[PDB]
Structure formats: C-alpha cells, structure tokens
C-alpha cells in the first residue's frame, strides 16, 4: 500500500497526440519532489500504436518507467477497455486514497452516437458518453479528486452526474489549452496531503497566469500566452445546490458564454440564475449554496477560444463564476431531448 495512487489516463489517439509525450516528460520531472515510497503515479498512455500502463519509479535521481501492462491498439474510450485499465491499475497499487486525471478531448454532457469526454479515432470516431464514463468509474475506487484535463468538463450537469464517484472535480468550463497541465508542478500537487484539489488548481492556473498576454500575442502550441480558467467543485455540496435551485425556480445575450465562437452550448451557471431569479431571499440563499459547492476559481481576464474553423482569438472572461450550464431553449432538438431524459440535473434541480 501507498498513501495515494493517482492514475493519469491519456486517451490521445486523436489530434492531441502531439502533446502527450511532452506531458509525460513533465510528469517525470515532477516526480523529483515526490516520495515514491508511499505515492504511486500511474500513467495509461494511448497515442495510437500499442498503449501501455506504467508506473513512474525513482532509482536515485532518475525516474524509471516500470511497465505494468501493455496492450494491442485499442479504443481507449470504450467502457470495457477503461474498466480493464482501472481494475489492473488499482489492483496492483492499492492505497489509502485515490486520484485520477482524464486527459483527452471533452465536450461536457453533450451526447455522441458511436458508430461527452474523450476521443479515440483509431478505428472510426469514438467518444465516451458521460453515463458510460460513470459506469466505468463504477469498478474504480472512490476518488479524492478527478481532474479533467479536457475542454468544457466543468459543467454542473457532468459533475452532478458523476457526483458519487469523487469528492472534488477540477476543470475548466471553457476550452482547455492544447498543452494542458504543467505536470512539473501539478504532479506533486496530485499527492499533496492537504487539499489536493485546491493544490492542483493553484499550480495548474499559476503557470498559465504567468505567461499570459492580454492579446494572446505570440501564442503557440509550444508557448501558451492565452491564459486559462479553472475551478474546483465539492461534490458533497451539489444536492443542496440542486435544492437551492428548485426554490429559486419556484419564483441570454447578457449571460457569460464559454463557447461564444461556436454553438453557444455553455453559459455561466451563476449568470443564468441571476437573470432568472424572482426573489432575493431565495436567491441570497442560492448564492450561499453556490459558494459552498464552488470552493476555488480563477481566470485570466481573457481566454483563447476557437471557432469551428479551428482558428481562434482571445475572449473576455468577464462574469466568470467557474461553472457552466445548458440553457434550455425549447427547440425540440436532439440534444435537448437527450438532456431532458438522461441528464439527472434536469430532474434534480426541478427544471419543469
């Protein structure tokens, strides 16, 4: 046993494949401040060829990649694949506490029909639906934290759907930079004895905050000057948030949008409630419950966002409260029909 086992799960058989090895090199540098006697950093790495599950171990001042298991080319967002990875990882390395990092593409709660989080383009375009992710997580231990190193995952719908899987969720409600986490300082925070979720957030944010330029001048995949936005949700507080939401309900251009250059699927949850609320008592209580659930947040004044074309620009994060939501537009669309049927948040927060 160790004190903690953290699995970094890299579904990188997709456009992001070029970032994976670099993050691995960062992770290896981060193990220098970590005592591997009690702490297990595991990495499942799929860049397209033959995936591997390793553990990083220190000899002296050198970190060595011990191979736990190797795999044929496989769909890393298939439920039984992820389950097998999980079962193996946490069986070989039990611990007193557990963490996990989901590294891939992401698009919140949105439905995707396989021939959502994570993409594998190895044999067709495969993506994981959040109910499928919740099923895979069911064979896993309960986590102290989940870090989504993936776009748009800090959604109240996603976190509520997965609330029984972890104590804390770390992510961005908007797009996450290509380079993702600075794992040279996030890795020791993954094993912080006190408040790892906050530690992870502070260390993640701080590197991007320091090379931030307001116009994203000189931004590149090798040098991200476009900033970042991050928050931490405490899952044990979501039920009260849902209950506080229902009470508010008993009484769009102006709400901050996290994908303003694309489909406008994502808006700031607090911004939504401020504009819908018809009673200060109900609302001032909602803000308290909101404060209890969203315990950490920070953003640079702008973030870089992209159009569907792939091009992009800096967008103002004015109004940022750290969590996104879907605003029902009543349009009979397929994603709303899915929302009203399979997103628990819809019935939990009483969106009637």
């Amino acid at each position: 046993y160790g004190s903690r086992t953290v699995l970094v799960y890299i579904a990188g058989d997709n456009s992001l494949s070029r970032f994976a090895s670099e993050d691995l090199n960062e992770m290896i540098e981060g193990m220098q401040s970590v005592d591997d006697n009690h702490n297990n950093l595991l990495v499942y790495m799929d860049k397209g060829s033959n995936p591997k599950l390793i553990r990083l171990r220190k000899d002296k001042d050198v970190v060595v990649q011990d191979v736990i298991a190797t795999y044929d080319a496989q769909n890393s967002v298939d439920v039984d694949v992820m389950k097998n990875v999980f079962t193996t990882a946490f069986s070989h390395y039990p611990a007193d506490s557990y963490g996990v990092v989901f590294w891939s593409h992401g698009d919140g709660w949105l439905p995707y029909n396989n021939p959502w989080w994570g993409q594998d383009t190895g044999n067709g375009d495969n993506r994981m639906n959040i109910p499928d992710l919740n099923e895979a997580l069911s064979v896993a231990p309960h986590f102290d934290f989940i870090l989504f190193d993936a776009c748009y995952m800090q959604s109240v719908e996603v976190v509520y759907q997965l609330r029984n899987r972890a104590d804390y969720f770390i992510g961005s409600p908007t797009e996450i930079p290509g380079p993702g986490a600075p794992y040279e300082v996030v890795v020791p925070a993954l094993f912080a004895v006190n408040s790892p979720a906050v530690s992870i957030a502070e260390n993640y944010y701080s590197v991007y905050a320091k090379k931030y330029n307001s116009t994203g001048a000189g931004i590149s995949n090798e040098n991200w000057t476009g900033g970042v936005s991050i928050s931490v949700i405490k899952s044990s507080e979501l039920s009260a948030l849902a209950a506080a939401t229902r009470d508010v309900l008993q009484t769009i251009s102006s709400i901050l949008c996290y994908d303003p250059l694309r489909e406008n699927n994502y808006h700031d949850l607090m911004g939504l409630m401020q504009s819908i609320q018809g009673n200060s008592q109900a609302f001032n209580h909602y803000k308290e419950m909101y404060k209890n659930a969203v315990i950490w947040k920070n953003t640079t004044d702008n973030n870089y966002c992209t159009y569907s074309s792939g091009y992009g620009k800096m967008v103002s994060m004015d109004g940022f409260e750290g969590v996104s939501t879907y605003i029902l537009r009543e349009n009979n669309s397929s994603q709303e029909k899915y929302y009203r049927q399979f997103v628990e948040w819809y019935s939990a927060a009483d969106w009637d």
Binding site: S15, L16, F19, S104, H105, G106, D149, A150, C151, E175, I176, P177, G178, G180, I219, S220, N221, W224, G226, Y304, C305, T306, G312
Partner: peptide
C-alpha cells in the same frame, strides 16, 4: 493552435 489547438485546445482540447
């Protein structure tokens, strides 16, 4: 430049 890419995002995730």
């Amino acid at each position: 430049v890419l995002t995730x």
